[PDB]
Design a binder for this molecule. Structure first.
Ligand SMILES: [Zn+2]
Lengths: 287, 48, 50, 272, 94, 70, 286, 53, 50
């Protein structure tokens, strides 16, 4: 009985507790615990995340408070749901993700206690634009050290979700742990109530921004579009057989031919239509 | 390697400079004898 | 009175610092050019209502 | 159970059907692929009352997904060529928000509409091939093209001409297998013209399926029959003696050596 | 009494119903503007008094009945002419 | 998809950027820039900036991580 | 007097899960929990929450349990892991509030004096209402009414934060529509913007039907006196507002002769450039 | 228990520095031996009357 | 455009002056603000090109 290509399920609230606790203590490598359920042999799920108080030692086994462990679990049994811990996490701000020296020491304690106890490393400050730098890892033994680690077998969902990155494989990858696959438990009864409630405005759709700011904009764009038409005349009346595909590449200027064309005309079209349709509907509805 | 400014009683309380880096206040380790940590002495200092 | 000082210290445990700099010039309404006292230059913004 | 469902395939025998039910209700994670595939094979082309109903009733409350993927093909395989009688089931599985079950309906609309140029099928299957969000169900859309169009292999290069040129590799992957299963053993040279940039893709696994589909099309074809045989035998031999490709990249190559000389050049593949 | 249908009131209606003389309707309405229970204006070449009114008070259940009928005309104008826009622009809606 | 490509490009320039100086131009869209942190670099640049503003020198904005011209 | 509350989008979410925790045995149809918040200004902010074991019986409808002991120690733990956070109020669900809510609110005002409750709607998620916030005032009562508790209104909204909108955008990835799409998107903004115009109308339709009928007591203070202010200003006076419509001609003028001509002439270039490239590649094929 | 927590939170290194001035709106400016100037809203485990520039 | 966006999201290179080359695809480079370095070459560049 040995590993395969596993799968990690995370709940929607779990990821939100990761990025919020990472954004809170952005300099000093925050630490917390990960609470879920072992559903089968080789897929792990997590439903809940609660953090840890800050220890002066740092991210290690000494940052784990056993009296804050059991008494926090004492409350969650009688309210919500009791379940077994399945792992832990921390935050590593100075890089993306790889298990460091004091990372790997406290991992050995957890895999001695649990079956797997999957680590999770998240950089909070790298994730900016629309994506998150989250990845989960899991330590390997020394029994197959001259053999091929990660004993994976009959599947084809292993080549996805990441190739081993060179900022991560320069450290303990791949002869020390292995990387694991993470998708999201995307659910209904949460997805639309997050979407429609976060981005919404009722009366904005038929406002006017009315005319003194708008006729000035219609005044402006036509004036350079006149000179854009004069520059459009200049290339059309030119029309010389100087190998015109080579004549165009020696006359590149980030300019007229069709790019600096009707793009403005489309904006002039859409602005006045939405302005006039809002004007005509408002005369219709109100008295 | 570094240099030591001084020490305080009942504890390490060791004040150590680099003259290029900053000045730390650190602890002695287990492999030292606490007598031969005289002032102005070059000493091997951990990185972490 | 002693417990008051302890709870003030538990409150006093999140002063992650602030970086001291000086405004060089004003770029836009919410973009500025500042410089650290020993470091490089930056383009920054304000909080909300500064 | 895989051996029992394969040897008793299409029997509609009650006794093998009964112990496969109590195998299914063991609720083990790893035999769910084993129970679901064999339960369809003993009920192939049956359209039974209790077979569809118990399998579609069991496929929501379970906790694993190997249990779901075995029953995914199984409820696709319980109906076969009914050609109008699955339409309530086809509408039911795709409207659900389960991604495996939507994928399961795509294999069901493939097997109920085998070899027929159904306009309603090619409209609806291509419709979810555009607008759906999960990659796995989008593949089973563009993989099901050969199952409904293998009788007339001429339309298949025309319709997958731009399906091979999407932006995601998953649509391009099932596009490559669609060339492999629509045209069975023809010396087409038009599909082979399409597969040449398909085996020269940046992404590895769509090249893999291009190698397998190139192996499926040209078994038992000499160089005088079509001039692309020995071109690809040395291309298979190049990438299998190559070192710096993936195991994923070379799994299709060693498999292509097994396909191309299968049966000692005595048998072929022909759905027709 | 007339809820802004044609709220430009003529001077003789004030001078009769208040039974005040004609020359003192202007000093009467400048006082009501000075207090601030109305925010209208005064013409004198036509002597019609234009009205914009923001002061609220009680409205005695019978005037809810007339307010219901005006709200019901308000209903079918909004409802039906939205069905015109949706049925016209259905194919670019999505 | 062409609009989402426009969106993720046109929000690379709203970041608390660092300030450097343009030094040399190699070829099409790749240059040497020296930062105010020193330690002279070599990065690729965008596809938007008109190249008639970088003739010997320019006060320029730089990315944090990829350190590109912005 | 609180200006408005700000819904951090973790708290609601963390009400949905705990309604789903007890939902396998859920027949109480209500979940009371403690609303953690960050008091900033007259405007209020909400960052976190947790739950409490709660029972209630409709029989005698005053028999219920918050747990003070559970409320002391678990909030003490959230104080220890985060010194920024404190209590600001509580919440419950099951969109019809019940008669007990005077008792819960007047109890736990001894934790924060200007405490505030927020009703979420876990099952209703459809038209126009994310949440609602209530507040308590006790004046004499009015000019002439008997005194009571009288839950009042605080306006509400859904706020956000940097490094949690990243979790918003990356977890959804479903429809991903931008506001751009100015032909198709802005017309639909006018469509369902007007589909709420009759929705608020059908709500004000139903209210004065059941109070003109005369069931519920007429709120003489605000419920129509604010409507008495309202019902005078759809001014549609014609013969000068008729002369608004050469500016309509002016807004039309830019569309007609500029945008229809140039768009046609540019596509006419694509004809001759193709008809040349058609046959001059055809005559050189042989 | 609080004093035990402060005991384990005064570990391990102490980066020495220089206080340049003090303000109220309690506030202080710190220059380290890395020659970097910092500012605080909250001073810490000392008394402001016990300190000076 | 997507290929243009991915290649720009990548860490920049360092500039350093070559003093003179070692043997077997190794050179001797001080960058600017550091010590010298003996590094390895890529595929497309050669010793004779240095
Ligand atoms: Zn770590």
């Amino acid at each position: 009985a040995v590993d395969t290509a596993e799968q990690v399920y995370i709940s929607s609230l779990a990821l939100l507790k990761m990025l919020k606790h990472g954004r809170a203590g952005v300099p000093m490598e925050v630490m917390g615990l990960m609470l879920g359920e072992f559903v089968d042999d080789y897929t792990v799920r997590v439903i809940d995340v609660f953090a840890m108080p800050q220890s002066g030692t740092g991210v290690s086994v000494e940052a784990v408070d056993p009296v804050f462990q059991a008494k926090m679990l004492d409350m969650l049994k009688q309210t919500g749901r009791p379940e077994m811990v399945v792992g832990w996490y921390h935050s590593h701000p100075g890089f993306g993700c790889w298990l460091s020296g004091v990372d790997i020491n406290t991992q050995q304690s957890f895999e001695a206690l649990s079956e797997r106890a999957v680590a999770v490393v998240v950089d909070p400050i790298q994730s900016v634009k629309g994506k998150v730098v989250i990845d989960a890892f899991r330590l390997i033994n020394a029994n197959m050290m001259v053999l091929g680690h990660e004993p994976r077998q009959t599947t084809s969902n292993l080549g996805h979700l990441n190739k081993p990155s060179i900022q991560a494989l320069i450290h303990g990858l791949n002869r020390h742990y292995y990387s694991i696959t993470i998708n999201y438990r995307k659910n209904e009864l949460e997805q639309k109530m997050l979407l429609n409630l976060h981005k919404k405005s009722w009366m904005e759709g038929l406002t006017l921004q009315d005319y003194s700011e708008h006729c000035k904009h219609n005044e402006s764009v036509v004036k350079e579009m006149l000179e854009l038409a004069k520059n459009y005349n200049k290339a059309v009346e030119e029309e010389d057989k100087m190998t015109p595909e080579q004549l165009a590449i020696k006359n590149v200027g980030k300019q007229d031919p069709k790019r600096h064309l009707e793009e403005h005309v489309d904006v002039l079209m859409t602005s006045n239509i939405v302005q006039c349709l809002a004007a005509m509907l408002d005369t219709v509805v109100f008295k | 390697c570094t240099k030591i400014i001084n020490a305080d009683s009942e504890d390490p309380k060791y004040i150590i400079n680099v003259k290029q880096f900053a000045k730390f206040v650190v602890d002695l380790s287990d492999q030292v004898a606490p007598t031969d940590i005289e002032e102005g002495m070059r000493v091997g200092v951990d990185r972490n | 009175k002693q417990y008051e000082k302890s709870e003030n210290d538990l409150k006093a445990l999140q002063s992650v610092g602030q970086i001291v700099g000086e405004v060089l010039k004003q770029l836009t309404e919410e973009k500025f050019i500042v410089k650290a006292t020993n470091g490089p230059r930056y383009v920054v913004g304000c909080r909300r209502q500064l | 159970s895989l051996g029992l469902g394969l040897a008793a395939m299409g029997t509609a025998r009650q006794d093998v059907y009964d112990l496969l039910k109590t195998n299914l209700y063991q609720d083990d994670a790893v035999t769910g692929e084993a129970a679901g595939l064999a339960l369809g094979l003993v009920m192939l082309g049956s359209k039974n009352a209790q077979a569809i109903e118990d399998m579609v009733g069991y496929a929501q409350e379970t906790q694993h997904e190997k249990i779901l993927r075995g029953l995914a093909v199984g409820i696709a395989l319980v109906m076969y060529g009914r050609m109008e009688e699955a339409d309530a089931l086809i509408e039911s599985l795709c409207r659900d928000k389960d991604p495996i079950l939507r994928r399961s309906g795509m294999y069901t609309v493939a097997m109920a509409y085998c070899g027929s140029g159904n306009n309603k099928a090619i409209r609806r299957l291509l419709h979810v091939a555009v607008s759906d969000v999960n990659d796995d169900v989008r593949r089973a859309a563009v993989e099901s093209l050969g199952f409904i169009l293998f009788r007339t292999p001429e339309q298949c290069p025309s319709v997958v001409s731009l399906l091979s040129e999407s932006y995601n590799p998953h649509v391009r992957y099932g596009a490559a297998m669609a060339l492999g299963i629509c045209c069975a053993g023809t010396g087409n040279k038009e599909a082979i013209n399409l597969l040449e940039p398909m085996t020269n893709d940046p992404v590895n696994y769509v090249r893999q399926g291009a190698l397998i589909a190139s192996a499926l099309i040209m078994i038992q074809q000499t160089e005088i029959t079509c001039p692309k045989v020995n071109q690809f035998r040395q291309l298979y031999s190049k990438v299998i003696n190559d070192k710096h490709d993936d195991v994923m990249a070379k799994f299709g190559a060693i498999l292509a050596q097994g396909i191309l000389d299968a049966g000692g050049h005595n048998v072929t593949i022909s759905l027709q | 009494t007339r809820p802004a249908n044609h709220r430009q009131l003529t001077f003789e209606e004030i001078a009769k119903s208040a039974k005040i003389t004609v020359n003192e309707v202007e000093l009467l309405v400048m006082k009501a503007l000075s207090v601030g229970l109305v925010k209208g204006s005064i013409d004198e070449v036509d002597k019609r008094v234009h009205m914009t009114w923001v002061q609220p008070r009680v409205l005695d259940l019978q005037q809810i009945k007339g307010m219901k009928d005006r709200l019901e005309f308000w209903c079918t104008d909004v409802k039906s002419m939205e069905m015109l826009v949706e049925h016209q622009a259905h194919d670019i809606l999505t | 998809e062409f609009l989402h490509a426009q969106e993720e490009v046109k929000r690379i320039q709203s970041i608390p950027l660092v300030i450097g100086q343009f030094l040399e131009a190699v070829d099409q869209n790749t240059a040497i820039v020296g930062s105010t942190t020193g330690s002279n670099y070599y990065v690729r640049i965008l596809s938007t900036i008109d190249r008639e503003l970088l003739k010997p020198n320019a006060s320029v904005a730089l990315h944090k991580h990829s350190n590109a011209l912005v | 007097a609180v200006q408005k509350v700000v819904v951090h989008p973790l708290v609601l979410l963390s009400v949905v899960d705990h309604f789903n925790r007890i939902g396998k045995v859920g027949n109480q149809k209500r979940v009371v929990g403690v609303l953690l918040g960050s008091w900033q200004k007259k405007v209020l902010d909400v960052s976190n929450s947790f739950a409490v074991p709660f029972d209630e019986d409709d029989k005698d409808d005053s028999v219920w349990f918050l747990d003070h002991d559970y409320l002391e120690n678990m909030y003490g733990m959230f104080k220890k892991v985060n010194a920024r956070e404190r209590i600001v109020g509580w919440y419950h669900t099951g969109p019809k509030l019940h008669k007990n809510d005077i008792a819960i609110n007047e109890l736990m005002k001894r934790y924060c004096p200007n405490s505030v409750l927020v009703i979420i709607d876990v099952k209703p998620k459809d038209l126009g209402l994310p949440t609602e916030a209530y507040i308590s005032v006790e004046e004499v009562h009015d000019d002439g009414t008997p005194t009571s508790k009288t839950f009042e209104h605080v306006t509400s909204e859904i706020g956000a934060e940097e490094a949690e909108e990243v979790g918003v955008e990356h977890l959804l990835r479903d429809i991903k529509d931008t506001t751009v799409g100015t032909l198709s998107q802005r017309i639909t903004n006018q469509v369902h913007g007007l589909k709420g115009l009759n929705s608020k109308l059908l709500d004000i339709r139903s209210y004065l039907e059941k109070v003109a009928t005369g069931k519920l007591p007429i709120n003489h203070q605000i419920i129509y006196q604010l409507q008495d202010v309202f019902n005078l200003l759809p001014d549609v006076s014609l013969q000068e507002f008729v002369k608004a419509f050469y500016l309509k001609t002016n807004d039309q003028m830019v569309v007609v002769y500029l945008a229809s001509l140039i768009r046609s002439v540019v596509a006419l270039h694509n004809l001759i450039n193709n008809k040349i490239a058609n046959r001059d590649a055809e005559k050189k094929e042989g | 228990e609080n004093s035990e927590k402060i005991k384990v939170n005064k570990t391990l290194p102490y980066l020495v520095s220089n206080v340049i001035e003090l303000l109220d709106v309690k506030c202080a400016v710190i220059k380290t031996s890395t020659r970097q100037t910092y500012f605080l809203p909250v001073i810490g485990l000392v008394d402001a009357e016990k300190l000076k520039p | 455009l997507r290929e243009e966006l991915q290649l720009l999201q990548e860490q920049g290179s360092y500039v350093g002056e070559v003093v003179r080359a070692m043997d077997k695809k190794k050179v001797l480079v001080k960058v600017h603000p550091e010590g010298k370095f003996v590094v390895d070459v890529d595929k497309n560049i050669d010793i004779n090109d240095v």
